[PDB]
Symmetry: C3
Subunit: 274 residues, 3 copies
């Protein structure tokens, strides 16, 4: 959308000088529209095209800009209070809407406005930040976190305590992406724009960033920045040249098989009852 | 109880075809009774008998079935809203009851109905899922999670961010069990029906599943599926046949002693004041 | 303050015999004053003096004593209820106050009374326990935990799921300390009075306790208990004498540089708008 894009990219350049008071009504109404579109899935920060994920940098700008144009407000919890500038996604929903939207929200799961939640997903208690997109069939398990602008595929299982990197602090060039049908093992972390290709199974306690060597014991090939589709990755170490010590690395031990599929499947009985 | 068992096991077979509307009042009243019994500790998903832990598969069925027979309902948080089908355990408690029940619930700790919480336990902010059983004296520290049907012994310390595997998704044959007097180190995970025998101390960042080699450096013996009573386990790696790389494993470095006991004890002053 | 110190240290000696009912009004009024001072930053459990961090053991006593002198009370969450004895810090705040205090509290971030939160900090959903002190500019990211009495410097970034050890259970001699300008990587844990010196960058999945060997590959020097200022630490392993297996250790791979600074900076746009 050019009528929105334009205004957004104009303002971003004056980011540091914009405040909730000196901001003109145009930039305000706009930034707000672009956030409403992300909330709805009509726009998404990154998308795959011609087998390549592409980042719409300017949508990442509007996300950033919302923090310069909005002012904090007291939010009454019940036993405590909060003070923040990003509204709660579900604050206005009634049953009708939850009924039409088709997902399940387990207390005290929390989602910020500007994040897209797809039909048939289950959010156990966890956090979904602004601009993230969570596709169909996915479960975000206990204490997991879907970082700002992150892109999560359909039928994904983010295990308990899993963290998917955001792009706000520290600031990142690209969002983190988990393609369709992946299983991310408990307590694992995926950050810094790494891409986990479809059908991959990341074991527990695996940490993947741009500096992580993803080692393929079979080919001897060492990847960086992405997990090839259908891999099973687990933690290991690689030895120093002098065998003096070893440093952490991710090891692709094999390609997903029935033995693997046995342990990581989605439980349809927990999904939406048609 | 045969009058309950029977009905439950009948229905389970038609699991995929049962919905919150076509379910007959018998199966409904029953499933509901079996959940009320679990909530109360009168029944428990697994139990030790003749020095062997046994799983009552049919109680795991009722847990599963509750998701087919109940419909979602809007739950009003304060600043947001939720939409789910498993009631909150403590929603009806008054002080009298909390006073009689003898445990402490730190906001915003959350427990689902169908989980048993014993006297003198302390729940820091954390999650206890349906069907779990948490025994006397235990503390569930910050952001820890007690997975569906998991069995936690007396006087256990589940450190911050610790995750004890559930049995719902991915679906599991047996619950995860932590016997009496164990200390589970921060950010560690125990899943897939592994058993941690009494008096063991699992260090921080230890991940135990059925595929985890538990190596006893002293005996050279490699375990799978269980931690022998009184062990102290920490993370390590085992080398490839070609010394090319190494893969994660759990290492039993020693048997618990006073030096160890010094660092992992329970603080009675925090327990219930008699 | 001697008029407070005295009373506190008197009572501590009778800790096990004091209860919310047999405690005399003096010890009660006092313990309560010392907690109000910690809440305000007027007193702090540990402080650096002459380039040495010092622990005021007697302030740690008052923290402990508050659990013996206060009785539990029902706290009404919205969808559930809690039963605990430490009030919520922000329960009384209005916008005026939040406005004057200058920090941001993202729901459902929770802080106990007795903890000091400095100006310009951002608390994503996380936990700050009694007696902790969080200095200026710092962000406590999602599901992080600042343990009882822990001391966090200015401009620190505690990543998602990071745990900073408390001193309550298990009981500890000294608090855990993170000096100014440090970045603690996702899912990492720092406990047992370890000190992370200023400007250090701890990678993801690093676990530091008193038994952790911090290995400097360059000097060959092995530290214990502290991370030398300006280090970049990541997980590795050290080999057994027989190369039979290896055990976890922290490895100082280098001194912080621009490449590093690129990935861990604070995002000022998210801080308080002056
Ligand atoms: C990866 C995993 C699924 C095992 O899958 P699998 O296909 O059965 O793998 P296998 O048991 O055949 O092992 C394959 C190889 O990798 C190793 N392996 C598998 N999982 C491993 C793990 N967690 N740690 C170390 N090694 C592991 C095996 O030792 C084996 O090595 P080898 O070929 O040299 O002998 C299991 O390790 C896992 O991650 N489970 C997830 C638990 C979880 O996160 N639950 C969520 C609770 S919310
Ligand atoms: C396991 C632990 C308790 C140490 O216990 P300990 O009995 O004092 O163990 P020691 O210091 O004697 O070390 C025993 C051996 O294991 C190693 N060891 C112990 N803990 C280790 C750890 N965390 N990482 C690596 N090695 C460790 C030591 O290097 C030593 O090896 P060695 O025999 O080859 O020299 C400590 O490591 C730990 O896990 N603390 C828990 C912290 C925690 O989770 N706090 C909770 C905050 S909510
Ligand atoms: C430490 C980190 C910042 C990399 O910093 P860096 O200065 O760019 O480090 P480099 O990429 O130059 O690597 C330095 C050395 O350490 C290793 N290294 C760096 N980070 C590593 C990691 N996470 N795992 C393993 N090795 C790592 C490199 O392999 C390299 O080893 P070498 O010198 O033998 O080749 C990055 O690893 C990291 O921790 N990012 C934090 C992500 C995070 O927690 N995000 C928060 C989301 S809430
Ligand atoms: N590491 C997180 C920090 C988000 C901060 C959001 C906020 O200030 O409200 C991310 O990049 O998503
Ligand atoms: N991994 C978790 C998932 C629980 C889902 C519960 C729900 O759908 O409400 C467990 O097996 O306990
Ligand atoms: N490991 C945590 C336990 C805190 C318990 C607080 C409570 O009982 O209320 C700490 O030492 O800070």
């Amino acid at each position: 959308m050019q009528q929105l894009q334009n205004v957004i990219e104009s303002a971003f350049e004056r980011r540091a000088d914009i405040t909730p008071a000196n901001v003109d009504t145009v930039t305000r109404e706009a930034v707000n529209q672009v956030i409403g579109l992300l909330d709805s899935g009509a726009l998404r920060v990154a998308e795959k095209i011609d087998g390549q994920w592409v980042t719409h940098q300017w949508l990442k700008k509007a996300v950033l800009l919302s923090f310069r144009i909005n002012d904090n407000k007291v939010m009454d919890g019940a036993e405590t209070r909060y003070y923040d500038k990003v509204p709660m996604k579900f604050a206005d929903y009634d049953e009708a809407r939850f009924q039409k939207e088709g997902f399940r929200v387990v207390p005290p799961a929390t989602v910020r406005q500007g994040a897209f939640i797809a039909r048939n997903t289950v959010l156990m208690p966890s956090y979904v930040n602004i601009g993230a997109y969570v596709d169909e069939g996915t479960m975000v398990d206990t204490w997991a976190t879907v970082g700002s602008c992150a892109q999560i595929g359909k039928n994904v299982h983010l295990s308990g305590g899993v963290g998917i990197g955001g792009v706000l602090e520290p600031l990142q060039a690209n969002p983190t992406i988990i393609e369709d049908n992946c299983f991310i093992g408990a307590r694992s972390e995926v950050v810094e724009g790494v891409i986990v290709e479809e059908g991959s199974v990341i074991s527990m306690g695996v940490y993947l960033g741009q500096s992580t060597r993803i080692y393929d014991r079979e080919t001897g090939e060492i990847h960086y920045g992405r997990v090839p589709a259908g891999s099973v990755v687990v933690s290991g170490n690689l030895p120093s040249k002098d065998g003096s010590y070893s440093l952490y690395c991710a090891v692709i031990v094999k390609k997903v098989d029935a033995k693997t599929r046995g342990k990581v499947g989605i439980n349809e009985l927990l999904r939406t009852i048609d």
